[PDB]
Amino acid sequence: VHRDTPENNPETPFDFTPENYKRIEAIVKNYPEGHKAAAVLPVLDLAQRQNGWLPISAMNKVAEILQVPPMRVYEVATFYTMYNRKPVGKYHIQVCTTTPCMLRNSDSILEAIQKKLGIKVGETTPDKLFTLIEVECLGACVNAPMVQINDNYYEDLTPKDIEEIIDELKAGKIPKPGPRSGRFSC
């Protein structure tokens, strides 16, 4: 589902940021002064970072602050793939399955992550620690295995190294830009 929006218990009750309200006003100043609807694309990402799982009522409150059409602002976040719509846990990890990564085994890393963290490849974990979702290209293709979680993307991870990093992530953060090899040249 992408077009359909729920009406029960997630349609009227939502909160807007108050501590980051001063930072939200500064974001509009970065673009053009008159005819500023450019901040709506940036504020959608900022609201998702502060409050997890963006609601339909939260999008309506964001459109009133920037002063724009309610139908246009709701549709703007629908086209983008970066913003989450349903629900995500503390740290949501996305795996790359695209052809440059698939050539040097990407499915082997995906199968190892699916069994160690349990549950299906599409459905998220009931414990709400790691959310599994099939994604396209992330960015850095230099490392053959690539996975992006929360903010920092881990590059070059083996079949046994990926499961060990996932279990360690439950208590302590584990950035691993290059576990396999140097980032510049390998």
Partner 1 sequence: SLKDEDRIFTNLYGRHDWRLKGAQSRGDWYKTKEILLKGPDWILGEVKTSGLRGRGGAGFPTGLKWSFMNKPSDGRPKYLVVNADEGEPGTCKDREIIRHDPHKLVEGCLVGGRAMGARAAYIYIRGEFYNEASNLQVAIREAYEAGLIGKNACGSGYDFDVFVVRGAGAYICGEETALIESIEGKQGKPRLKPPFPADVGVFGCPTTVANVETVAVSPTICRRGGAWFASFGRERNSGTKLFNISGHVNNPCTVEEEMSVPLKELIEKHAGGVTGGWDNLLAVIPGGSSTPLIPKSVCETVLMDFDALIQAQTGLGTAAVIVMDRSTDIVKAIARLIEFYKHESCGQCTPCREGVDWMNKVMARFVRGDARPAEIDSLWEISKQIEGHTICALGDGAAWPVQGLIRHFRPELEERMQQFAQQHQ
Partner 2 sequence: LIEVFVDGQSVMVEPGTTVLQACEKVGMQIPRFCYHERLSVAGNCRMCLVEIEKAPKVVAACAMPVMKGWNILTNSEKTKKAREGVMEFLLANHPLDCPICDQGGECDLQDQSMMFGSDRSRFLEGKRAVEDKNIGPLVKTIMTRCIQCTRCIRFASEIAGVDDLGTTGRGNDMQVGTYIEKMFMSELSGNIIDICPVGALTXXXXXXXXXXXXXXXXXXXXXXXXXXXXXXXXXXXXXXXXXXXXXXXXXXXXXX
Annotated binding site for [2Fe-2S] cluster: 96, 101, 137, 141
Contact flag: residue 146 with ligand FES (CB under 6 A): yes
Backbone φ and ψ for 50, nearest 5 degrees, come out as: -75, -45
Identified binder of ligand FES from the candidate list 73, 101, 147, 157, rule CB under 6 A: 101
| Exposure letters 129-159 (e unless 16+ CB within 10 A, then b) | ebbbeeeeebeeebbbbbbbbeeebbbbbee
Contact flag: residue 72 with partner 2 (CB under 8 A): yes
Stretch touching partner 2 by CB under 8 A, among 1-9, 28-36, 140-148, 178-186: 1-9
Contact flag: residue 54 with ligand FES (CB under 6 A): no
Nearer to partner 1 by Cβ, of 22 and 35: the residue is 35
**C-beta of 78: minimal distance to partner 2 in Å?**
5
Distance separating alpha carbons of residues 50 and 162, to the nearest angstrom = 28
Nearer to partner 2 by Cβ, of 86 and 90: the residue is 86
Stretch touching ligand FES by CB under 6 A, among 26-34, 49-57, 94-102, 108-116: 94-102
Backbone φ and ψ for 64, nearest 5 degrees, come out as: -75, -30
Spell out where the chain is interrupted, by the residue before each break (C to N > 2.5 A): none
Contact 93, 138 (CB under 8 A): no
Nearer to partner 2 by Cβ, of 79 and 184: the residue is 79
Using CA atoms, how far residue 115 sits from 4, 90, 118, 168, 181, in Å, is 31, 20, 5, 16, 26
Distance separating alpha carbons of residues 121 and 67, to the nearest angstrom = 39
**C-beta of 117: minimal distance to partner 1 in Å?**
20
Contact flag: residue 12 with partner 2 (CB under 8 A): no
Q: What is the binding site for partner 2 (CB under 8 A)?
A: 2-5, 7, 56, 69-72, 74-75, 78-79, 81
